[PDB]
């Protein structure tokens, strides 16, 4: 039964865009419809965040905070100075100014969005010691995000998240294939990549780096430029955080809050080869992943990196082993779901037979009842007790 009235906030991964972008084709629902609308129609207040798809989790978390409470994005003086980008970003009205008076939210995050959600909770609760020290030493102002003491996230649910990274980044042609993936998602929305649309269509939100698609430039041309830009070559990127080493680094500081419920959902769309031990793409897996990514994910081993046979099962984009919660470089605890959703730990909800993009509806799958999946989840989140009492 309903135990809380906290709104749900949706958060995309390394692909993703606002509700008005992509001519209205939703990241959350894709060819299946509009998940946010379904939830609202069923009585679960739901909102959508749109942050830089290729940006670092840190940048995205600062953007999410501002988008939630309102104001001008502040990446932190220390951070900005370390990485060489602007300290201030775009300005937002604030989706939920209610959070500045004591409200809470549930975040449902897909792909990288799960790393961002975790980091947002960590910064909200603990702030950043490095930013506080830098403000004290240099007399710069400090965003409240870095002070600590905010407890506005009741839960975080991750779906297909590379908590321990994805080996996809280890492909020798990853740079070219990753951008081909962005082209594939544009294709899902019936948008061409070789056309210089005057409309923005898909905004990468690279204000901090000073990058934007120019007049006369197609997505193909733009992506060529992004490949040689700091959002692709620096460590302050989705590229880095998505990697196994980068994810491990993030895990070393981004911990589970004792005050928050965590739910993890894994995805797989593969079968095992009996003679090779490799994993292969199932029929119905999105066409891009099936040809370009899945074969590699299902066969790449790297002993010194710790990539063993457990990593081969995948959803076309991320290794299933990486999805139940952070493990590499992490102190977080993961407990298999048994009917009781425990606080301050990852409740491993298991593995679902769907593809990285099918789970959000960007790729079709008539056998996956997407509406039921999200409604069931919404019901579960609404049942969470904001305060648990100890008992026998
Ligand atoms: Ca499919
Ligand atoms: Zn940054």
TrEMBL record:
Location of the Lipase-like C-terminal domain: 4-366
SUPFAM superfamilies: alpha/beta-Hydrolases
Swiss-Prot/TrEMBL keywords: Calcium, Hydrolase, Lipid degradation, Lipid metabolism, Metal-binding, Secreted, Signal, Zinc
EC number: 3.1.1.3
Entry-linked InterPro entries: AB_hydrolase_fold, Lip-like_C
Positions annotated to bind Zn(2+): 59, 79, 85, 236
Record has Flavoprotein as a keyword: no
Location(s), subcellular: Secreted
Single GO molecular function: metal ion binding
Residues where Ca(2+) binds: 284, 358, 363-364
First-level EC class: hydrolase
GO cellular component, one term: extracellular region
One example of a Gene Ontology biological process annotation: lipid catabolic process
UniProt entry tagged with the keyword Translocase: no
Reaction equation(s) it catalyzes: a triacylglycerol + H2O = a diacylglycerol + a fatty acid + H(+)
Primary residence: secreted
Stated name of the protein: triacylglycerol lipase
Species of provenance: Geobacillus stearothermophilus
């Amino acid at each position: 039964s309903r135990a809380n009235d906290a709104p749900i906030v949706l958060l995309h991964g390394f692909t993703g865009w606002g509700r008005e972008e992509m001519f209205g084709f939703k990241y959350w629902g894709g060819v299946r419809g509009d998940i946010e609308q379904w939830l609202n129609d069923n009585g679960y207040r739901t909102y959508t965040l749109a942050v830089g798809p290729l940006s670092s989790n840190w940048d995205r978390a600062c953007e999410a905070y501002a988008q939630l409470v309102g104001g001008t994005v502040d990446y932190g003086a220390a951070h900005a100075a370390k990485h060489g980008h602007a300290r201030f970003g775009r300005t937002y009205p604030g989706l939920l100014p209610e959070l500045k008076r004591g409200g809470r939210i549930h975040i449902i995050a897909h792909s990288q969005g799960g790393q961002t959600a975790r980091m947002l909770v960590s910064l909200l609760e603990n702030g950043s010691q490095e930013e506080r020290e830098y403000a004290k030493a240099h007399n710069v102002s400090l965003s409240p995000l870095f002070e600590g003491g905010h407890h506005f996230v009741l839960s975080v649910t991750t779906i297909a998240t590379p908590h321990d990274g994805t080996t996809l980044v280890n492909m020798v042609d990853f740079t070219d294939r990753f951008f081909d993936l962005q082209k594939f998602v544009l294709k899902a929305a019936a948008v061409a990549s070789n056309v210089p649309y005057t409309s923005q269509v898909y905004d990468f939100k690279l204000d901090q780096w000073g990058l934007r698609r120019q007049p006369g430039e197609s997505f193909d041309q733009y992506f060529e430029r992004l490949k040689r830009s700091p959002v692709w070559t620096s460590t302050d990127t989705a590229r880095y955080d998505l990697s196994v080493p980068g994810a491990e680094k993030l895990n070393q500081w981004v911990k589970a809050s004792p005050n928050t419920y965590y739910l993890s959902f894994a995805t797989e769309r593969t079968y095992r080869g009996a003679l090779t031990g490799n994993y292969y793409p199932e029929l119905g897996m999105n066409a891009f992943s099936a040809v370009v990514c899945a074969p590699f994910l299902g066969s790449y081993r790297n002993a010194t990196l710790g990539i063993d046979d457990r990593w081969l099962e995948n959803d076309g984009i991320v290794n299933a082993f990486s999805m139940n919660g952070p493990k590499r470089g992490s102190t977080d605890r993961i407990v298999p779901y048994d009917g009781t959703i425990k606080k301050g730990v990852w409740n491993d909800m298991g593995t679902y037979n769907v593809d990285h993009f099918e789970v959000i509806g960007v790729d079709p799958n008539p056998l996956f009842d997407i509406r039921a999946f999200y409604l069931r989840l919404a019901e579960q989140l609404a049942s969470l007790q904001p305060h648990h009492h100890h008992h026998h």
